[PDB]
């Protein structure tokens, strides 16, 4: 019953996938790993594979420090941007839940505006 709880931010952007594990108070972080720290290719930084590797590494580190259960708070880049988590976020979440940590109270904390300022692209959209 005396299992120490932390919280894990999962930042799922279209270029990187941040996995951050902190204690209950948002300060005093424990372990932060990005997608680029596990892959050296300059093209697989946003891939689900890099997110999975980062989640495994941060799971090993958080098991080492002492904590054994984390509440997951996942978010996209948000704002005027896409505001919906991408496949790197689900990959990191599945790899975190796979490695034996107790997972409870999964909640999306993406920043959603009350119809805020303009976005880049200028009337013809981001040409993609």
């Amino acid at each position: 019953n005396s299992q120490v709880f932390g919280v894990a931010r999962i930042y799922a952007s279209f270029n990187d996938t941040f996995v951050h594990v902190t204690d209950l108070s948002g300060k005093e972080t424990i372990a932060r790993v990005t997608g680029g720290m596990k892959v050296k290719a300059d093209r697989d930084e946003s891939s689900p594979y890099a997110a999975m590797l980062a989640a495994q590494d941060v799971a090993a580190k958080c098991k080492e420090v002492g904590i054994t259960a984390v509440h997951v708070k996942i978010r996209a880049t948000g704002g005027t941007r896409t505001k919906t988590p991408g496949p790197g976020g689900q990959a990191a979440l599945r790899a975190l839940a796979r490695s034996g940590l107790r997972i409870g109270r999964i909640e999306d904390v993406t920043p959603v505006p009350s119809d805020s300022t303009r976005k880049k692209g200028g009337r013809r959209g981001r040409r993609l």
Binding site: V4, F5, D23, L24, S25, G26, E28
Partner: peptide, 28 residues
């Protein structure tokens, strides 16, 4: 009883008390 938190050791010129007196937690 809601959980645990960690903080650095109270060394000189930066106590462990005043580095803790304002944290906000969010629990279900």
């Amino acid at each position: 009883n809601v959980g645990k938190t960690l903080v650095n050791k109270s060394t000189g010129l930066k106590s462990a008390s005043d580095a803790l007196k304002g944290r906000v937690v969010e629990v279900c």
